[PDB]
A paper describes a structure:
The gamma-tubulin ring complex (γ-TuRC) is the principal microtubule nucleation template in vertebrates. Microtubules are formed de novo in a process termed nucleation, which is spatially and temporally highly controlled by γ-tubulin complexes, composed of γ-tubulin1 and associated γ-tubulin-complex proteins (GCP). In most eukaryotes, microtubules are templated from a preassembled γ-tubulin ring complex (γ-TuRC) that determines the position and direction of microtubule growth.
Extensive 3D classification revealed a core of six γ-tubulin-GCP spokes as the minimal stable and most abundant entity in this experiment. Since only one copy of GCP3 is present in this intermediate, this clearly indicates that the MZT1-GCP3 module of GCP3(8) (rather than any other copy of GCP3) is involved in forming the lumenal bridge. As the only MZT1-GCP3 module present in the 6-spoke intermediate was already stably recruited into the lumenal bridge, MZT1-GCP5 and MZT1-GCP6 were the only other candidates to represent this additional MZT1 module. Notably, GCP3(8) and the adjacent GCP4(9) subunit create a structurally unique binding site for this MZT1-GCP5 module, which likely explains the specific binding of MZT1-GCP5 to the outer surface of GCP3(8), while MZT1-GCP3(8) remains available to form the first module of the lumenal bridge.
Residue numbers in the entry:
A (entry chain L): 282 to 304
B (entry chain b): 11 to 75
C (entry chain I): 1 to 63, 79 to 202, 256 to 285
D (entry chain H): 245 to 278, 285 to 347, 361 to 505, 524 to 545
E (entry chain a): 7 to 105, 113 to 129
F (entry chain J): 210 to 336, 357 to 388, 391 to 410
G (entry chain G): 150 to 191, 201 to 387
The structure:
């Protein structure tokens, strides 16, 4: 279920008006 | 939600951290087996117990060889 | 903050670290949102980026003063050594994307490998600029410093010198085969001490002159 | 007032950088506070004082060139060791926001000895170059400490690379071309005619290293003399005619010597 | 969930064989895990952190001994786990050296003076 | 409402059309730098002296500058004075304290002037010498292939983050020959 | 204090004249013997008038610092600084019940200080490679002591430490340090060096045969010390 949720793709666009860990 | 999935990102982060910690100790564990025993310890269990059973089942590929 | 300095170390100065030809990248600005000891760490850090900026200035002035084919060769390798300093900044920014809990000391620690290369290559550039070395004795003063004693400056200048030989390997190929002399003027006709490096023996140049001159007949 | 501010300042004085509430008063004295915590901090500040000692020396000799290639290699060694010390500090920096492990004393205890030993090593090597420098690092490999012998063995591998480089410049060439005297052979300015064999090459006894015996230095002097004599006189040329270093000295040297003298 | 079906997944993870292709171990394993479902020594991750340090020094790698100090800070920074001690002690226990006394190492208290 | 609402939500329209930024900010100094600079100004007691800029994020500026380098004209960024591009200072990103940003955009404008004058000459033959005509076609031939690369790069923005340092270092072997 | 500085120089001249091949015996700087911050041991109101259950927290808090040497808030290090003797004085206004226990917990502090002086002063070379090896494994146990006191320092913060539990806790580490301190004063007493302190460790291994805690300790130390020889 964690490995089932795990296979999702994450954004690799990080903000410059949010540099400190945005989503 | 959206903040509820950044937590799923964050446990993936820690489990890749634990994956490197597993690989440089030269364990037989991979990420998937590690993903089972964290759930076991979330239910609560002796790591002394789990190490014993893993040291038994790894000898069960030797009991059929 | 975690990109502001990382542009200050590159070709941009900022008003935080003001540029000067006397000495650039000077902190004079006081920040109440920093610990007072951070100024000293930044003071250690700014010395390297100042050298990088100065190296850029030398390429700006030249790609009658300093001119020659060797001078259009010596600057070219100076680009090539600076390239890992660019890549090593990109890696820093990629680190700071995920974990911003790193400090200035991490950046200094990471770019400590350029605090052996850059200071000892800086003096060579200042020697070549202050003196009017623009003939073929620039290869000597590179070779005088490439022996080193620190391995990082041993490998750097080795690259830089090599391309110069590749330039002179093109002049000495037209001469011995097609019989063309004066393929590059200085800084009958013969090679003299200005257009001759000080580690090729004198006899070889006479042999080369014989070989090149006999082609015309 | 709290412990955490003291942790933050002591984290800076590891670099040799004054804190905010602990500052250096006199350089020869240790760091002085600008109750139990106050008594505790001084042992940690001793490390930064020792750190300044090494950092100044490698600051200055690295930009010095009459110190010779052997010696600039010593700067390389010192800087390479110092780089790893910052790796701890960065980790300690990020771990802010428990944090005291006897205020990290247990973390710091092993680099404390490595700082002490290197601060000794710079002073036993003070004002030396070449084989004089090499004997000074050979002094500390009479030890019976595992940590110390493992420490010295790497540094000696670093410092002894130029002298072996000069050694193989004298077996396959025989042409002495140093600028700083870190070789044990002293070529004369005069190029002698027939005193070439007797007078042109002389043995310097100061720049003999501590891993070469006196015997070996004398023989490889003979090797270089022979292979140079073959060039200038005889004009026959076979091109490139041919702790300790685990018997590679006595392996290579005698074979080269034998072959060269035979050919001559 | 239930712990028994999780241990069944573990037995089909280590051994490739199915739950109907092995069950003789799995029933003896449910004997040994039973009433050992909670810590029995000190559950501080402090002690296992300083013992993972001593196990990594035993491999003669010092760069990783400062790397684990960053891995352990990442575990604290996200904080998804409630008992960080047990999985770290697990990874410490199954360690293999790639190349009697107990007074030269850190021992745990037996919890004869504290509840478990 | 119903198309304006979709505009506000799912299109940007917040510096190039005057409607101040509602870009989500998760503050805290790495990108709260304007506010900490204002508080530092207040501690130095200015008193008040208020600056007005329109508050954009970084990447829009990157795409606009790449458009400027490709050869098109009349953009919102870079005020034009007499024919020469010049950096505008009414445009702010939160960090880089408004002085670095001026320098980086001034450098890109310094390249853009060189591109603009050549494309101006090329446009002035479109509204017997025959050698000028053969010259501009070769200039044009450089320019079309040159535009191709930047146009490729701008596509990859839509599909990954790209910063200023990427785009300046990427165009080194072209800005070399441009000199 | 004063007496080691002569001894080192005299024995250095002895071993230099003794050698039949070569010079160059190494030295350390002066400061390693001079500094009192390279050794583990170097409000103001009467605690007695306070409530009792605060006095206990106070005394265990000072005592934990004292265990690895550094001084206490109501604990003073008594000034001698000569031999393997070291005593401390807790405040004379203390209740009897605590005071008697503090007396009995003090031996691990004394057998910390005597241990920590030995390793620093006999880090010199005149006692040889074997004394270097013997000191090299004695340092490890001091580090292991520091481990334990860090763990209890965390434990006390959670309101889970008292003097009675602490009294039980320090008991295994008291005996080990006692073995080390007895070894140190014996080695110092005979001025043992070279093979003379390789016979002594050979004997002490046979001495412990019913204990088996300290026997393994002497076994490891004798394994370490015989390595250069």
């Amino acid at each position: 279920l964690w490995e089932a949720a795990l296979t999702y793709e994450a954004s690799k666009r990080r903000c410059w008006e949010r540099v400190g860990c945005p989503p | 939600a959206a903040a509820a999935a950044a937590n799923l990102n964050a446990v993936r982060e820690t489990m890749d951290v634990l994956l490197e910690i597993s690989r440089i100790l030269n364990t037989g564990l991979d990420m998937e087996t590690l993903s089972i025993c964290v759930r076991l310890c979330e239910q609560g269990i002796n790591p002394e117990a789990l190490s014993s059973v893993i040291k038994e089942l790894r000898k069960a590929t030797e009991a059929l060889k | 903050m975690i990109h502001e300095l990382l542009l200050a170390l590159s070709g941009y100065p900022g008003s935080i670290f003001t540029w000067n030809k006397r000495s650039g990248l000077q902190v004079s600005q006081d920040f109440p949102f920093l610990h007072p000891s951070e100024t000293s760490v930044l003071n250690r850090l700014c010395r390297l980026g100042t050298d990088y900026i100065r190296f850029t200035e030398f390429i700006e002035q030249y790609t009658g003063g300093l001119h020659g084919i060797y001078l259009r060769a010596f600057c070219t390798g100076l680009d090539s050594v600076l390239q890992p300093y660019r890549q090593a900044l990109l890696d820093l920014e990629q680190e700071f994307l995920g974990d911003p809990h790193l400090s200035i000391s991490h950046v200094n620690y990471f770019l400590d490998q350029f605090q052996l290369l850059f200071p000892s290559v800086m003096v060579v550039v200042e020697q070549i600029k202050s003196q009017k070395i623009h003939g073929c004795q620039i290869l000597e003063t590179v070779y005088k410093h490439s022996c080193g004693g620190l391995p990082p400056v041993r490998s750097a200048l080795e690259k830089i010198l090599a391309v110069c030989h590749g330039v002179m390997y093109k002049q000495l190929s037209a001469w011995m085969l097609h019989g063309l002399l004066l393929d590059q003027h200085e800084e009958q006709f013969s090679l003299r001490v200005e257009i001759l490096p000080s580690y090729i023996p004198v006899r070889v140049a006479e042999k080369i002159l014989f070989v090149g001159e006999s082609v015309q007949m | 007032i709290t412990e955490a501010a003291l942790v933050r300042d002591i984290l800076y004085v590891f670099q040799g950088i004054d804190g905010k509430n602990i500052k250096m008063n006199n350089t020869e004295n240790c760091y002085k506070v600008e109750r139990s915590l106050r008594d505790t901090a001084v042992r940690l500040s001793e490390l930064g004082w020792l750190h300044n000692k090494i950092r100044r020396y490698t600051d200055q000799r690295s930009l010095d060139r009459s110190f010779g290639l052997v010696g600039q290699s010593f700067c390389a060694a010192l800087h390479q060791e110092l780089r790893e010390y910052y790796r701890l500090l960065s980790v300690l920096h990020s771990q802010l926001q428990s944090l005291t492990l006897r205020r990290l004393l247990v973390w710091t205890y092993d680099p404390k000895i490595r700082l002490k030993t290197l601060a000794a090593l710079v002073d036993h090597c003070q004002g030396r170059k070449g084989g004089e420098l090499a004997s000074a690092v050979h002094a500390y490999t009479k030890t019976g400490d595992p940590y110390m012998r493992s420490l010295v063995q790497h540094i000696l591998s670093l410092v002894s690379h130029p002298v072996l480089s000069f050694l193989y410049r004298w077996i396959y060439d025989g042409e002495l071309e140093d600028t700083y005297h870190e070789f044990f052979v002293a070529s004369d300015p005069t190029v002698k005619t027939d005193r070439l064999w007797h007078d042109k090459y002389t043995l310097r006894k100061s720049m003999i290293p501590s891993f070469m015996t006196m015997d070996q230095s004398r023989k490889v002097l003979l090797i270089g003399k022979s292979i140079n004599f073959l060039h200038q006189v005889c004009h026959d040329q076979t091109p490139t005619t041919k702790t300790d270093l685990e018997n590679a000295f006595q392996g290579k040297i005698d074979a080269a010597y034998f072959e060269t003298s035979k050919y001559l | 969930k239930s712990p028994n079906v999780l241990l069944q997944n573990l037995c089909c993870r280590i051994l490739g064989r199915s739950e109907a292709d092995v069950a003789q171990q799995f029933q003896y394993a449910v004997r040994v895990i039973g009433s050992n479902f909670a810590p029995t020594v000190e559950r501080d991750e402090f002690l296992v952190a300083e013992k993972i340090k001593k196990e990594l020094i035993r491999q003669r790698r010092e760069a990783d001994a400062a790397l684990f100090s960053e891995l352990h800070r990442k575990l604290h920074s996200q904080g998804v786990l409630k008992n960080k001690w047990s999985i770290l002690y697990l990874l410490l226990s199954l360690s293999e050296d790639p190349r009697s006394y107990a007074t030269l190492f850190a021992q745990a208290l037996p919890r004869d003076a504290h509840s478990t | 409402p119903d198309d304006r609402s979709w505009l506000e939500h799912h299109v940007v329209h917040q510096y190039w059309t005057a409607r101040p930024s509602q870009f989500p900010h998760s503050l805290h100094l790495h990108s709260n730098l304007a506010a900490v600079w204002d508080q530092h100004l207040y501690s130095s007691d200015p008193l008040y002296v208020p600056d007005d800029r329109v508050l954009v994020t970084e990447t829009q500026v990157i795409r606009e500058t790449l458009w400027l380098l490709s050869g098109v004209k009349k953009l919102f960024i870079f005020q034009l004075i007499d024919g020469k591009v010049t950096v505008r200072n009414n445009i702010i990103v939160t960090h880089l304290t408004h002085s670095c940003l001026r320098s980086v955009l001034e450098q890109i404008a310094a390249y853009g002037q060189v591109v603009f004058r050549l494309q101006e000459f090329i446009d002035e033959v479109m509204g017997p010498f025959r050698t000028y005509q053969a010259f501009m076609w070769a200039l044009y031939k450089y320019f079309i292939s040159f535009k191709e690369e930047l146009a490729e790069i701008e596509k990859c923005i839509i599909n990954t983050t790209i910063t200023l340092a990427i785009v300046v270092d990427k165009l080194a072997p072209r800005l070399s020959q441009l000199k | 204090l004063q007496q080691s500085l002569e001894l080192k120089r005299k024995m250095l001249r002895d071993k230099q004249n003794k050698k039949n091949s070569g010079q160059h015996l190494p030295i350390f700087p002066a400061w390693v013997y001079e500094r009192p911050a390279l050794i583990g041991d170097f409000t103001a109101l009467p605690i007695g008038t306070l409530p009792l259950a605060s006095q206990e927290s106070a005394v265990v808090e000072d005592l934990l610092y004292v265990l690895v040497g550094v001084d206490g808030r109501y604990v003073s290090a008594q000034p001698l600084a000569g031999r393997q003797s070291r005593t401390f004085l807790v405040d004379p206004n203390l209740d009897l019940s605590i005071r008697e226990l503090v007396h009995r917990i003090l031996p691990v502090a004394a057998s910390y200080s005597a241990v920590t002086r030995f390793i620093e002063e006999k880090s010199s070379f005149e006692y040889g490679q074997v004394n270097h090896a013997l000191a090299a494994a004695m340092r490890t146990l001091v580090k292991e002591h520091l481990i334990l006191v860090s763990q209890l320092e965390q434990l006390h913060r959670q309101g889970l430490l008292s003097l009675q539990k602490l009294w039980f806790y320090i008991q295994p580490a008291m005996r080990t340090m006692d073995i080390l301190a007895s070894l140190a004063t014996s080695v110092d007493k005979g001025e043992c060096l070279g093979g003379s302190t390789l016979s002594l460790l050979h004997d002490r291994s046979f001495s412990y045969t019913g204990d088996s805690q300290a026997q393994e300790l002497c076994l490891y130390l004798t394994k370490a010390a015989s390595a250069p020889y």
